[PDB]
């Protein structure tokens, strides 16, 4: 699996680079719940939600293109580690209300975007 390796790297590099640009540009605007790190998780949820519904209806796509979107792009674009340190930093700052809110908005929000992705492509069919 070397063709598979390139799907992960090409997809992942595009995702990580989008996260890097979005996070450095926007995170500082609202430091209680950094919007760049949120947007990349909500966007990745939206992409993989649509991918969930789409790959079901098109079962004979190449595993290359499937692996490039999910493990590559969505894997690289989203982040749990950045989400953790933001929360951890708020916890050490004594900012529990926003630490809790961050956890809810990221988790609840990402599932909502996955649902919106899934149910838009499902309904458009």
């Amino acid at each position: 699996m070397i063709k598979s390796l390139f799907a992960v790297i090409i997809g992942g590099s595009v995702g990580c680079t989008l996260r890097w640009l979005l996070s450095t540009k926007f995170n500082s605007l609202f430091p209680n719940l950094p919007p760049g790190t949120l947007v990349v998780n909500l966007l990745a949820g939206l992409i993989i939600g649509t991918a969930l519904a789409y790959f079901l209806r098109q079962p004979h796509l190449d595993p290359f293109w499937k692996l490039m979107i999910t493990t590559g792009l969505c894997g690289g674009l989203s982040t749990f580690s950045t989400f953790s340190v933001e929360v951890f930093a708020l916890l050490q700052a004594g900012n529990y209300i926003w630490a809790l809110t961050s956890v809810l908005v990221h988790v609840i929000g990402s599932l909502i975007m996955s649902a919106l992705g899934f149910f838009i492509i499902t309904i458009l069919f």
Binding site: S23, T24, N27, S28, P31, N32, P34, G36, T37, T82, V85, E86, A89, L90, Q92, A93, G94, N95
Partner: protein
């Protein structure tokens, strides 16, 4: 590039041997502020203590009466780029 240095550093209240200082917080996630203070004259040793990021005030006790003290405040703050790092200080002078 938002400023992580505090602003509006001033003495709100003062006895002969203590100062109450307050500052406007920077628009970043401050973990703690480090307050340093020492006698402006010469080379008496400068002391520092920390206060939590939730607090935007501090009491400096055990000072000498009628002495010029230099007082600085800097933050230890989270940012996406630098992670935990120390800001540049904001400084004031105050005679007891």
């Amino acid at each position: 590039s938002v400023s992580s240095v505090p602003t509006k550093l001033e003495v709100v209240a003062a006895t002969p041997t203590s100062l109450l200082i307050s500052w406007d917080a920077p628009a970043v996630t401050v973990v703690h502020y480090v307050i340093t203070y020492g006698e402006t004259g010469g080379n008496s040793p400068v002391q520092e203590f920390t206060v939590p990021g939730s607090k935007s005030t501090a009491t400096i006790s055990g000072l000498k009466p009628g002495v010029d003290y230099t007082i600085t405040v800097y933050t230890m703050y989270y940012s996406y780029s630098d992670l935990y790092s120390y800001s540049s200080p904001i400084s004031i002078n105050y005679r007891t």
